[PDB]
Amino acid sequence: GREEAPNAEADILSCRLPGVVMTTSPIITNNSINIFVGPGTDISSLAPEFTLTPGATIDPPSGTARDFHSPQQYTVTAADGFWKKKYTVSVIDTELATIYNFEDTLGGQKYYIFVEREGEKVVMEWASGNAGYAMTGVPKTADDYPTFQFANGKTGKCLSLVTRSTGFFGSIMGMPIAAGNLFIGSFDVGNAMSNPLKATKFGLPFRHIPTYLAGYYKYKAGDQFTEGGKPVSGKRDICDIYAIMYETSESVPTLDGTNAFTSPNLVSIARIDDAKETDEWTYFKLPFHMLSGKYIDKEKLTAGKYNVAIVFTSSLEGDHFNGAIGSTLLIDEVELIYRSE
Ligand SMILES: C[As](C)(=O)[O-]
Ligand SMILES: C[As](C)(=O)[O-]
Ligand SMILES: [Ca+2]
Ligand SMILES: [Ca+2]
Ligand code: NA
Ligand code: NA
């Protein structure tokens, strides 16, 4: 029958590049698309094609050739001619960034999105659950979210991850707390409050053999550990810091919160095993373990058939709502170290 609440604004629902192999699915947010192509692809004249909300139009039209050396804007107008939305569409044609100083974020947003740059060119957007937290109605400003930027880093600014209450609305959804996280991948806001573990899509293509994840942290557990909203006395919160490498396929384009450590597609895992509460910047250097009966194939590697994810969280079991509100993980000067070829 007739739609109950018409969604007003019209969306780009998909993106593809006819005749170019994308290295992973385009990452679509409310007002942005990131398209990934192999290093060496000519990006001076790409012609993205979109699907849209029925009855919408897009300007310039779907299939217009443009120069994506810089991001290009499109406007979608709803059928009614009143509602419009601007999207920024960017093409990433470089290999994954591996040096993270947490200085750079996207301006003009209601919460922080950390990016990696080469000069003025953005080459990666980190993801978090921020889009999901916005849906609880709790945050007022960028600093109220679980994932934000803090001025006092080890050098310059740093990443700050704080486990937050999700308030009344979060509790009625069975989601009473929100861990601060940051990861390589994307956040699918359509699952944020229906299948939250499916919302965190971990990994992007990586064409080297990672050997160590290194960097610095500080950590303070929150005062009162809770399990599904219920206080528990014997427990102190702890952070998690980890990285995974897995082989992609038609059936496994990404891993997520349901299978980050268990998917048979995993080839390698690095993970902190001596995390502690500390107010001093503490070095970690996590070796990647290649898993039993797995191997990194050279030709798959060069073809881009493996993804790597790096994940930080202020509450190790926060993804299952076990954690302490106020748990705070600061991260700075991280490096993904890989073998020289
Ligand atoms: C960061 As947005 C307004 O494209 O979801
Ligand atoms: C109705 As409008 C502000 O999306 O042009
Ligand atoms: Ca608008
Ligand atoms: Ca820094
Ligand atoms: Na919309
Ligand atoms: Na960087």
Numbering used by the authors: 0, 21 to 360
How does the study describe this entry?
BT2081 from Bacteroides thetaiotaomicron (GenBank accession code NP_810994.1) is a member of a novel protein family consisting of over 160 members, most of which are found in the different classes of Bacteroidetes. Genome-context analysis lends support to the involvement of this family in carbohydrate metabolism, which plays a key role in B. thetaiotaomicron as a predominant bacterial symbiont in the human distal gut microbiome. The C-terminal β-jelly-roll domain contains a potential carbohydrate-binding site that is highly conserved among BT2081 homologs and is situated in the same location as the carbohydrate-binding sites that are found in structurally similar glycoside hydrolases (GHs).
The final model includes one BT2081 molecule (residues 21–360), two calcium ions, two sodium ions, two cacodylate anions, two acetate anions, 19 polyethylene glycol molecules and 251 water molecules in the asymmetric unit. Crystallographic packing, as well as PISA analyses of BT2081, suggest that a monomer is likely to be the biologically relevant form of the protein, which is consistent with results from analytical size-exclusion chromatography (anSEC). A calcium ion is present in the N-terminal domain on the surface near the start of the domain. Unlike those proteins, however, the calcium in the BT2081 N-terminal domain is quite solvent-exposed and, as three of the six ligands are solvent molecules and another is a crystallographically related molecule, this bound calcium ion is most likely to be an artifact of crystallization. Another shared feature is a conserved calcium-binding site on the convex surface of the β-jelly roll. In BT2081, this calcium is octahedrally coordinated by a water molecule, the carbonyl O atoms of Asn120, Thr174 and Lys176 and the carboxylate O atoms of Glu122 and Asp351. As a consequence of these extended loop regions, a significant distinction between BT2081 and its structural counterparts is the presence of a deep solvent-accessible pocket in BT2081 formed by highly conserved residues from the concave surface of the β-jelly-roll core and five of the loop regions extending from this core. Similar to the carbohydrate-binding sites found in type B CBMs, the putative binding pocket of BT2081 contains several highly con­served aromatic residues arranged in such a way that they form a twisted platform to which a potential polysaccharide could bind.
